[PDB]
Design a protein around this ligand. Structure first.
Ligand code: MNR
Ligand SMILES: O=N[O-]
Length: 152
């Protein structure tokens, strides 16, 4: 798992996200969609977004970004003790939304990129290591539930 020190880093980094949850959420989703257009096809409500300008202009996309990062923040603040929080998400993403685990790798990478982009020189090597571990833990625990369901 993560050490106490590592969790403290993760939640310190998370402070940056919480100052502007919508802005971070928006940029994370745009990074995902532009980098991996197939991901956009999983969202009936974002399929109409034909350009980054349109994405940037979408208030509903920002709204969804807030929902997303709020959920992730809840999970992170449990410091690995997140079974109750993670289970329903694993299940809706496998069974309803059909999100391959690869897309969760994509969005994890997007979060790391966005943190650097918004906080250049202020997301240090130790912070990136800790945040990376936390996101891998999240991914890995979801993947365990995906395996249970035989999804993908
Ligand atoms: C590639 C696409 C997908 C990725 C990656 C992804 C990654 C993540 C992610 C990782 C950090 C978190 C946290 C996350 C959290 C959520 N997510 Mn998700 N999610 N996610 C969807 C696609 C994806 N998610 C879709 C599609 C919906 C339904 C949206 C709608 O039509 O209103 C949804 C909905 C949701 C909801 C609403 C409740 C529900 O349906 O369970 C939350 C919360
Ligand atoms: O964008 N993930 O729901």
């Amino acid at each position: 798992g993560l050490s106490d020190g590592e969790w403290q880093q993760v939640l310190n980094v998370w402070g940056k996200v919480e100052a502007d949850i919508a802005g971070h959420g928006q940029e994370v989703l745009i990074r995902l969609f532009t980098g991996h257009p197939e991901t956009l096809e999983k969202f009936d409500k974002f399929k109409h977004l034909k350009t980054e300008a349109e994405m940037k202009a979408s208030e509903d996309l920002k709204k969804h970004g807030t929902v997303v990062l709020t959920a992730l923040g809840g999970i992170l603040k449990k410091k690995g003790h997140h079974e109750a929080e993670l289970k329903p998400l694993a299940q809706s993403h496998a069974t309803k939304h059909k999100i391959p685990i690869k897309y969760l790798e994509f969005i994890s990478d997007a979060i790391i990129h966005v943190l650097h982009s918004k906080h250049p020189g202020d997301f240090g090597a130790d912070a990136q290591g800790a945040m990376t571990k936390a996101l891998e833990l999240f991914r890995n625990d979801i993947a365990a539930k995906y395996k249970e369901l035989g999804f993908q």
